[PDB]
Design a protein around this ligand. Structure first.
Ligand SMILES: [Zn+2]
Length: 1340
């Protein structure tokens, strides 16, 4: 058909070919050129029609003419035309899928292009590599053996070298493993270069560095018998002894520069290999109480390799990099165009150097490299590379805190982006990046409304989820931007935009940051494997595949991993989650030890020293700080103190390492301020006040010289502002303890101007300074007028990351209240644990009974905040897993615990609306009592107690008890309790019966006096608020009559409910209780009020019956130690304690969706797992319980052996009862993290020492394994508050088990808990110890 017609045309074309034949002269060549262009037109049609055969007919004549052209020399009759025509023929051979004749035919293409300058032979080699690759892809090894040298074998040896160089460069662009092919070419290249001619020494040197790149990532030493380091040092020796010509001095540079750069990389890789080898070869009777199990599990295999750093090689290493920058600076900054061979390899190498500088934390010199990269891209006219470099510059400048210089480079990227094609992936990726940069620029310049709009559109772009390593890195930066918006106060953004942001999936900033950290570790695993950081062998070793972009991405990912850890550690430390932060700090320290970077190590040691200070561990804090000094002093009262603001020392020229030094003085002052050395900590803190503005000035001065802008960058950058704010906080805190010194007073105002000028970035520090303002103005008291009540035997034994798989690259009072309102709204979205409690309780005192509902919400909001943060992080992991597998109960729990689930308005209207909804959810028959103490001075224990009683269909009731007036202060009770605990440890050492028993008996009497002191001295008459109410209509009527009469007696705030609760317990109202109540409530006429109360109490007496109900206690960090359950009044009621008020409502949500079989149905006695005597040192315990436990029906367990973790998981998830008799809470068998990941269904009866005890370290909140059990859904948890001896605690276990189990179906556990307290001989030292966490349970 058309092909047959083409055959006829080919016949005419053959006649035309014959016509061109014989014809001689440029005119004949012109006629031949016309025929060639016609053949090109015919080939265009044939190619379009895939008529390879028809094109091949013309190609056959053309190939013959190509062979004829090879005979002798022919002028460039068809420049590019010949290449394009031959390209069609090669494409036709590719269309024929036959590559055997393709490679010989590219030879004819090479033969046709023979007498030309090196730029001309650049296209055939790309095809030559390409026809090689697809044939190699199928597996044609024979064609792989064919390279240019043997194929040609007929060329000028010098020109053959340049052809071989082009093949090597083309092989780097191939996105597959090409180590062996590249190695073959280099060996042929080395053979050609003579070893005696001075010009041959140059060629030998250039070829040697290519071998170093191949050997650095491939083990080919079995063939070349030379290591990477020896070859690279051999190259430098040859380069040193060269005296070049003036024309080629440009090429001497970029050869010496590339050699020095690759000296650094291959010596760095050797150090990393050595570290992994050292690591791989490299790989406790406190059981009485495991409260510190995690602390010991952090290990001590540190602080040794840290001193193995800072050897003189580190500076010697940095000398190589700095000299390479100097040489490349000379070559490029000159006006004249460069004369190098491949400017692309110069551009590619510069990107690797730029990335390495950021890894070693030298960002200023990384900015110089990126400026030169843009210079190369402008000459190369590659618009994609110019935009990429400009985006990196803007990202770098923002981190340094310079929003002014960031904008110009952001706009330069936009202009260069237009020249690109709008359909490629590069355009889409770069457009999204610039919008992300613009969104961050809006956030820094206080334009949040438009910034949120841009970010939302970026998050809603369908292309962001494309599977590639470049997209994964953009996703990481998107998540870090989300945390920036999630850190803002509520007033910045409207309710509509807040809902849209939280609907994406991230609630709190730490959740977003943790998700970013997970993604980065996934990229590392997808790139280099996990041996670099995971420390454990993953039973597989992946390749690295250095194809150019993989090499630069390798160093970029590592830098961002360290950068992410810094933000995560600082933010988690500020909230109060010290334990979680130390895990991130230690993992980052391990990475920096393997890379051997002293600069990054010093920064992370400083942060760890800050964390240890918050836990009141001075010895470890002092150990860390001295390690910093050795690293700092060898790298460059410390010597760096008192430095002029022009110092060019290695520690006086870099902003990163100046911040490390500034934090050192702050942490050093904190240690001295806690050790009693005032006037030295104050003097130290003055230096940080002086230093920070000076440091910013030098960085501002230096940034100008680097970028060569004209004006100073408008406002001074903002990177040391956080340090200056914390320094200003500490100084004002010591002003309270020394109010005599008027000098510290101006600091409080001087600090406030600094913080108020940078709203809304230093908002947490603004809140702290406002709180000190309230306390300074503050100094019963002035809070009295807001409240309605004014005060009138043988010694016994004492018992890290989750990687994810990624797809292939394929009046004074009013002023104080108004001031605190501003501070509360600045931190409520993400409250720190310490500050929030102080603010809420202080505000609650001032509001008093002027607003009962706001008072109840404030007191409720101030307890167990760190648990609330950890629960929200836990829920995100739960919901994310469900989405991975493929949730209504989880969604409602998130809204219950969220911080931003509020409407708009003035304080406190939205909170009262949200609080009223929560009250309506309270189950019937439950009384919720909150006990917390108000601390006026932060850092000390207060003497004022707050009590709130919450019930269904009843307004909240609150009351204040000041204990400083009477003897037996609340601090005295707390001090006495700790004195008993210390004497218990000392008495255990004695080894005689008489002194042991006599001492133990005395301790029991002291505990009895303390418990009775709680009821009489502390609670007084207000113990009635803890007892339940009554259902008879008697009390309500009497309160109705008494309310009017009591108002005329002088009661400021008459409340109907308070009298009703107190009149219900009229049976136990002692006559002394009446006097305390009557005098406080009615100061005007105390005698008259006594008459009415006595008249009313007498009538109600005998006519009251107690009801069946439940009491739940919520206690703060200090009051949770004391045994409230063992008070004389509460020895007849079921009492449990919960972490917070919201936890009670969480059980109701879970209970309705059928997720708690124990609460819904009951406990089946035939589902029990016991762990008895695991460590085999409690013989008397075993013989008292072995026989009883074994004979029971359906009971399984482990005796005398350590259980496996798999056994314990089945017990908690599938069995109903878990009994542990041994040392501690069994944290070793099941740690805290393992408990959190499972759904706990069983009831935990852990009879170990200090199992249900929360450790209070410093001002941080309590921690323990009991919180993990409650957060996993445990119905009830039973444990001990202090240490107990085995023989007595065995009696308690016996009484509780025999009584409860033998009681029959339908028996409540709490009733028999109180019964068993009488079994032990020491009824107040051992009997009071067991407590219950959770909700009451029963048998089926
Ligand atoms: Zn200096």
């Amino acid at each position: 058909d058309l092909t047959q017609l083409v055959d006829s045309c080919k016949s005419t074309v053959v006649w035309m070919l014959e016509a061109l034949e014989g014809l001689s002269g440029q005119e004949l060549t012109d006629h031949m050129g016309m025929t060639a262009s016609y053949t090109s037109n015919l080939a265009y049609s044939f190619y379009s029609h895939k008529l390879y055969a028809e094109a091949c007919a013309i190609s056959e004549p053309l190939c013959q003419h190509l062979g004829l052209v090879k005979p002798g020399t022919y002028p460039e009759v068809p420049p590019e035309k010949l290449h394009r025509c031959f390209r069609l023929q090669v494409e036709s051979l590719k269309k024929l899928g036959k590559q055997a004749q393709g490679c010989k035919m590219v030879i004819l293409w090479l033969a046709a292009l023979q007498p030309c300058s090196p730029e001309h032979m650049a296209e055939p080699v790309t095809f030559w590599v390409r026809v090689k690759m697809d044939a190699a892809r199928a597996g044609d090894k024979e064609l792989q053996l064919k390279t240019l040298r043997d194929s040609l074998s007929g060329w000028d040896p010098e020109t053959l070298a340049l052809l071989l160089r082009e093949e090597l460069q083309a092989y780097k662009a191939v996105r597959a493993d090409t180590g062996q092919e590249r190695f073959n070419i280099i060996c042929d290249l080395l053979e050609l270069s003579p070893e005696e001619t001075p010009a041959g020494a140059w060629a030998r040197a250039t070829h040697l560095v290519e071998l170093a790149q191949v050997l650095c990532y491939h083990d080919f030493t079995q063939q070349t018998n030379c290591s990477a380091l020896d070859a690279i040092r051999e190259a430098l020796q040859l380069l040193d002894s060269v005296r070049p010509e003036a024309q080629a001095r440009d090429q001497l540079l970029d050869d010496k520069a590339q050699a020095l750069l690759w000296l650094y990389i291959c010596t760095l890789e050797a150090k990393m290999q050595e570290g992994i080898e050292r690591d791989r070869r490299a790989q406790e009777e406190f059981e009485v109480n495991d409260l510190n199990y995690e602390d010991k599990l952090q290990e001590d295999r540190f602080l040794y390799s840290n001193i193995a750093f800072n050897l003189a090689a580190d500076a010697a290493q940095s000398k190589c990099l700095d000299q390479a920058l100097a040489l490349w600076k000379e070559l490029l900054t000159k006006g004249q165009a460069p004369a190098v061979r491949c400017l692309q390899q110069t551009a590619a190498s510069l990107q690797i150097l730029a990335a390495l500088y950021q890894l070693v934390a030298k960002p200023m010199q990384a900015l110089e490299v990126l400026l030169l990269l843009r210079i190369v891209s402008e000459r190369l006219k590659d618009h994609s590379k110019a935009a990429g470099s400009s985006c990196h510059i803007t990202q770098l400048l923002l981190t340094l805190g310079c929003p002014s210089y960031a904008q110009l480079h952001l706009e330069e990227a936009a202009s260069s982006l237009k020249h690109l094609d709008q359909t490629t992936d590069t355009y889409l990726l770069l457009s999204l990046t610039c919008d992300l940069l613009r969104s961050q620029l809006y956030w820094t310049h206080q334009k949040v409304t438009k910034g949120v709009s841009l970010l939302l559109s970026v998050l809603r772009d369908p292309a962001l989820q494309k599977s590639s390593k470049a997209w994964y890195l953009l996703r990481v930066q998107v998540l870090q931007l989300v945390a920036a918006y999630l850190s803002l106060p509520s007033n910045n953004l409207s309710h509509s935009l807040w809902e849209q942001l939280c609907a994406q999936g991230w609630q709190t900033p730490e959740i977003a940051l943790i998700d970013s950290h997970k993604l980065l570790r996934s990229i590392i695993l997808l790139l280099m494997g996990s041996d670099i950081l995971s420390t454990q062998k993953a039973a597989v070793e992946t390749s690295f595949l250095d194809y150019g972009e993989n090499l630069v991405q390798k160093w970029q990912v590592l830098s961002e991993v360290l950068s992410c850890s810094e933000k995560l550690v600082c933010h988690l430390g500020r909230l109060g989650s010290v334990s979680e932060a130390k895990a991130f700090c230690l993992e980052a320290l391990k990475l920096t030890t393997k890379l051997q970077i002293p600069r990054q190590c010093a920064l992370f040691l400083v942060l760890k020293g800050e964390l240890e200070l918050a836990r009141n561990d001075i010895d470890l804090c002092q150990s860390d700080l001295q390690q910093v000094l050795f690293l700092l002093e060898s790298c460059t009262i410390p010597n760096f103190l008192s430095h002029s603001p022009t110092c060019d020392c290695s520690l006086c020229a870099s902003p990163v390492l100046t911040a490390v030094c500034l934090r050192w003085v702050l942490v050093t002052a904190g240690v001295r301020l806690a050790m009693g050395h005032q006037a030295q900590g104050l003097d130290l803190l003055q230096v940080v006040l002086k230093g920070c503005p000076e440091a910013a000035e030098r960085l501002t001065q230096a940034l100008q010289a680097s970028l060569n802008h004209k004006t100073p960058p408008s406002l001074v950058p903002s990177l040391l502002d956080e340090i200056l704010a914390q320094a200003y906080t500490l100084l004002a805190l010591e002003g309270l303890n020394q109010p005599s010194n008027e000098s510290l007073q101006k600091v409080l105002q001087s600090g406030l101007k600094f913080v108020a000028a940078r709203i809304p970035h230093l908002e947490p520090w603004r809140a702290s300074l406002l709180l000190i303002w309230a306390l300074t103005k503050l100094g019963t008291q002035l809070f009295a007028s807001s409240w309605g009540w004014q005060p009138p035997p043988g010694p016994e034994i004492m018992r890290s990351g989750e990687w994810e798989l990624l797809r292939l690259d394929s009046s004074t009072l009013d002023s104080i209240c108004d001031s605190l309102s501003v501070a509360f709204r600045g931190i409520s979205h993400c409250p720190p644990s310490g500050l929030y409690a102080h603010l809420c309780r202080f505000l609650a005192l001032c509001l008093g009974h002027r607003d009962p509902y706001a008072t109840a919400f404030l007191v409720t909001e101030s307890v167990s905040i760190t648990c609330r943060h950890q629960l929200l992080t836990h829920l995100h992991r739960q919901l994310s897993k469900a989405q991975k597998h493929r949730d209504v109960p989880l969604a409602r729990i998130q809204r219950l615990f969220s911080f931003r689930a509020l409407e708009s308005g003035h304080f406190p209207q939205p909170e009262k609306e949200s609080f009223q909804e929560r009250l309506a959810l309270i189950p019937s028959g439950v009384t919720v009592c909150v006990l917390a103490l108000a601390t006026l001075q932060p850092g000390t224990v207060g003497n004022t107690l707050l009590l709130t009683r919450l019930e269904k269909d009843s307004p909240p009731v609150s009351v204040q008890i000041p204990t400083g007036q009477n003897k037996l202060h609340l601090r005295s009770v707390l001090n006495e309790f700790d004195a008993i605990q210390k004497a218990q440890k000392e008495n255990s050492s004695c080894t005689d019966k008489r002194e042991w028993w006599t001492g133990r008996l005395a301790l029991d009497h002291r505990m009895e006096v303390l418990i009775a002191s709680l009821e009489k001295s502390v609670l007084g008459c207000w113990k009635g608020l803890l007892l339940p109410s009554s259902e008879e209509p008697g009390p309500a009527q009497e309160a109705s009559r008494l309310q009017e009469l009591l108002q005329d007696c002088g009661w400021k705030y008459p409340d109907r409910t308070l009298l009703k609760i107190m009149l219900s317990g009229a049976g136990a109202l002692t006559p002394q209780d009446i006097q305390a109540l009557a005098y406080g409530l009615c100061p005007t006429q105390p005698e008259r009020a006594q008459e009415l109360l006595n008249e009313a109490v007498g009538r109600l007496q005998g006519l009251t019956v107690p009801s069946n109900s439940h009491l739940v206690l919520v206690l703060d960090k200090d009051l949770q130690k004391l045994p409230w359950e063992s008070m004389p009044s509460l020895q007849a009621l079921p009492v449990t304690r919960l972490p917070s008020f919201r936890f009670l409502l969480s059980y109701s949500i879970i209970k309705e969706y059928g997720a708690s079989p124990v609460l819904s149905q009951g406990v089946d006695p035939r589902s029990t797992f016991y762990v008895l005597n695991p460590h085999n040192n409690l013989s008397s315990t075993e013989e008292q319980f072995r026989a009883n436990f074994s004979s029971e029906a359906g009971w399984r367990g482990v005796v005398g052996e350590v259980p496996r973790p798999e056994q314990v998981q089945e017990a908690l998830t599938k069995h109903d009862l878990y009994i542990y008799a041994g040392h501690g809470a069994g944290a070793r068998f099941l740690d805290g993290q393992a408990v959190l990941r499972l759904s706990c269904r069983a009831v935990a009866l852990l009879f170990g020492s200090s199992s249900a005890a929360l450790a209070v370290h410093g001002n941080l909140e309590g921690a323990g394994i009991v919180l993990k059990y409650i957060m996993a859904g445990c119905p009830l948890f039973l444990g001990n508050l202090w240490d107990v001896t085995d023989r007595d605690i065995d009696r308690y276990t016996e009484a509780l088990l025999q009584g409860w189990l033998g009681a029959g179906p339908g028996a409540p556990l709490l009733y028999y808990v109180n019964q068993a307290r009488q079994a032990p001989r020491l009824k107040y030292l051992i009997g009071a110890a067991p407590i219950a966490y959770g909700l009451p349970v029963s048998l089926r």
